[PDB]
C-alpha cells in the first residue's frame, strides 16, 4: 500500500477524477476569498482615510478589490471622501457573496465528476484506454488565456466597458479609479507608467491567441516529443511549477520595490521611500515654494497637507517590523489621531539644529543634533557623568509650526528630550494606545507581508520543480534500479 | 507471555458516524450560547 505522501497519486491514471479534484481545490481558493472579504469588511473602519488609512489598518484582500475599481460598500461609504449614491450589484459585499456562491457551484461540479469519472470522452480511439492529447489540450487553454488577457486590456482597463484601474498622483495625496489609455512607445515599459498595463494585456493578448491557433494546428516533433516527454501528465506539472515561481518572484519584487500595479496609497510606502528621502525632498521643497513668495514659517507649514506629513514617518515603513509581531500596524502604536506639527530645535543662540534620522537597520538609534552643516552639536548621552555636549549645557528649545502645538515653545529639560526622541521617527504625532491596547513596538505593512509569503512560497516551489522534474526524466527507475547495470565499467 | 484470548475488535459503521457527528455539533450549538454568556 501507499505511504502517506503518495496518497494523491491515485488520480494520476484516470483523467476524470483529476477534474473533480481540481474543482475541489478551486472551490476552496474562491471560498477563502469570499470568507476573507466578509471577515474583513465587518472589521473595517472607513472613518479617517487621511490618517488611519486602509493600509495601516492591516488588511489583505480589500486593496486587491479596490485596485480594479471597487470603491463602494453596501453600507453606503466610499474611500475617497464621499458616500455611496448607489453601490450597484458589484460592491464589497456583493463581490464577497459572488465568490461563495461560486464556491458552492464548483463544489457540486466536483461531486459530479467524481461519481461519473468514466466517460467516453477520455478513452481515445484506436487504443480504447485513458489518454490525453497533451499538446492540443494546451492550445485550447492558451487560446482562452490570451482571450481573457485581450479582453481585460481592451475593456476593463481602457474603460470602454470596464471601469479602469487605480491611478494615483506621485505623492499619494490623491488618486482613484479612472480609465487609462495605453502607451505604446518606450514609456510602456516604465513600470510606474499605468499606461503600460493596458498596453501589455492588449499586446500579449493577441500573441497568445496567435500562439493558441498555432498549437491547435501544429503537432509536435518526434525529436522534441521524447526529449520533453510530452506523453506523460507530469511533464506539464514540473513545468507549471516552474512557471509559477518565475511569476512569484516578479510579483514579489514589484510589490517590494513598488510599481504602478501597487499604488502606495493602497499598500503603504516602500522602504525605499524612507531612506532615499522621497518625502523629505518634497516637504522641504514645498516650504521653499511658499517662503519664496514671503511668509512666516507657521504659514507654510500650515499649508503642507496632513497626509504628506503622515507618509514621512518610520512607523509606516514595512521594514521596521517583526516576524512574530502579529496583527495591524494600528495595533502597534495606536490609531493616529492628529498631526502634532513640525518641531524646530533652536540653540541658545538661536542656531537651528537638525536631527539625524534613524536608518531602517538598528532597532534603536541614539539621538543627535547635527547643525546646518552636519556636525554634532547636542545629544542625549549615555554617560551622564562626563558630558560636555549634552543639551542642558546647550539649551535646545522646540518650536512647533501648525498641527496641534501651533506656534508654541518649550525649554523644559524633560519635554525637549521627549520630542527629540520622537524626532528620529520622521514627523511627530498623537495616538491613542488604549483603543486597540497597543504594545508600542511597530509592525509591517501588507506590502511587507505579501512580499514575505510570495518569496517563501516561490523558493519552496523551486524544490517542487526539481522533484517533479526529476520524476519525469527518471520515471523508469523510480522503484529502484534494475539488476544488471554493470555495463558502465569504463 | 501468552497471547490474550480476549482480543476483540471495535467497529463503527457509517450510519453510526452520522449519529455521532450530528450529536456532537447539535449540543455544541446548544451549549456554546451559554459558555460565552
Amino acid at each position: 500500500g501507499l505511504p502517506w505522501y503518495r496518497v494523491h497519486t491515485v488520480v494520476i491514471n484516470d483523467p476524470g477524477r483529476l477534474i473533480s479534484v481540481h474543482l475541489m481545490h478551486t472551490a476552496l481558493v474562491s471560498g477563502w476569498a469570499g470568507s476573507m472579504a466578509l471577515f474583513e469588511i465587518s472589521v473595517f473602519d472607513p472613518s479617517d482615510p487621511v490618517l488611519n488609512p486602509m493600509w495601516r489598518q492591516g488588511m489583505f484582500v480589500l486593496p486587491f478589490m479596490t485596485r480594479l475599481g471597487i470603491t463602494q460598500s453596501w453600507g453606503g461609504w466610499t474611500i475617497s471622501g464621499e458616500t455611496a449614491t448607489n453601490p450597484g450589484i458589484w460592491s464589497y459585499e456583493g463581490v464577497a457573496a459572488a465568490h461563495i456562491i461560486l464556491s458552492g457551484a464548483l463544489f457540486l461540479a466536483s461531486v459530479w465528476h467524481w461519481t461519473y469519472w468514466d466517460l467516453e470522452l477520455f478513452r481515445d480511439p484506436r487504443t480504447g484506454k485513458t489518454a490525453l492529447d497533451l499538446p492540443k489540450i494546451f492550445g485550447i487553454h492558451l487560446f482562452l488565456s490570451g482571450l481573457l488577457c485581450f479582453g481585460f486590456g481592451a475593456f476593463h482597463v481602457t474603460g470602454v466597458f470596464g471601469p479602469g484601474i487605480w491611478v494615483s498622483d506621485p505623492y499619494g495625496l490623491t488618486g482613484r479609479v479612472q480609465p487609462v489609455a495605453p502607451s505604446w512607445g518606450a514609456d510602456g515599459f516604465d513600470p510606474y507608467n499605468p499606461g503600460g498595463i493596458a498596453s501589455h494585456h492588449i499586446a500579449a493578448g493577441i500573441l497568445g491567441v496567435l500562439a493558441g491557433l498555432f498549437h491547435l494546428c501544429v503537432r509536435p516533433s518526434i525529436r522534441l516529443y521524447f526529449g520533453l516527454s510530452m506523453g506523460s501528465i507530469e511533464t506539464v506539472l514540473s513545468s507549471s511549477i516552474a512557471a509559477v515561481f518565475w511569476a512569484a518572484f516578479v510579483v514579489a519584487g514589484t510589490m517590494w520595490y513598488g510599481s504602478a500595479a501597487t499604488p502606495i496609497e493602497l499598500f503603504g510606502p516602500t522602504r525605499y521611500q524612507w531612506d532615499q528621502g522621497f518625502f523629505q525632498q518634497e516637504i522641504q521643497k514645498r516650504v521653499q515654494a511658499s517662503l519664496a513668495e514671503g511668509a512666516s514659517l507657521s504659514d507654510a507649514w500650515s499649508r503642507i497637507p496632513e497626509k504628506l506629513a503622515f507618509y514621512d514617518y518610520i512607523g509606516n515603513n514595512p521594514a521596521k517590523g517583526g516576524l512574530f509581531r502579529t496583527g495591524a500596524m494600528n495595533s502597534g502604536d495606536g490609531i493616529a489621531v492628529g498631526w502634532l506639527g513640525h518641531a524646530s530645535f533652536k540653540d541658545q543662540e538661536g542656531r537651528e539644529l537638525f536631527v539625524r534620522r534613524m536608518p531602517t537597520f538598528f532597532e534603536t538609534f541614539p539621538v543627535l543634533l547635527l547643525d546646518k552643516d552636519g556636525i554634532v552639536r547636542a545629544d542625549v548621552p549615555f554617560r551622564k557623568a562626563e558630558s560636555k555636549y549634552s543639551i542642558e549645557q546647550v539649551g535646545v528649545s522646540v518650536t512647533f509650526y501648525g498641527g496641534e502645538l501651533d506656534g508654541l515653545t518649550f525649554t523644559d529639560p524633560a519635554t525637549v528630550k521627549k520630542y527629540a526622541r520622537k524626532a528620529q521617527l520622521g514627523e511627530i504625532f498623537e495616538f491613542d494606545r488604549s483603543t486597540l491596547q497597543s504594545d508600542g513596538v511597530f509592525r509591517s505593512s501588507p506590502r511587507g507581508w505579501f512580499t514575505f509569503g510570495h518569496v517563501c512560497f516561490a523558493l519552496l516551489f523551486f524544490f517542487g520543480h526539481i522533484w517533479h522534474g526529476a520524476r519525469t526524466i527518471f520515471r523508469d527507475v523510480f522503484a529502484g534500479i534494475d539488476d544488471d547495470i554493470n555495463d558502465q565499467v569504463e | 507471555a501468552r497471547p490474550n484470548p480476549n482480543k476483540q475488535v471495535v467497529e463503527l459503521n457509517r450510519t453510526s458516524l452520522y449519529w455521532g457527528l450530528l450529536l456532537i455539533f447539535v449540543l455544541a450549538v446548544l451549549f456554546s450560547s451559554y459558555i460565552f454568556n
Partner: peptide, 30 residues
Amino acid sequence: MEALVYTFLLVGTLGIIFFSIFFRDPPRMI
C-alpha cells in the same frame, strides 16, 4: 468574534445533513 463562531457551528450541522443524505451507506438488500 462569537458571531462567526456561531455561524460555523450552524453550517457545520448543515454539512452533515448534506453528507447524510447523498453519501449515506446504501442499504443493500438480503
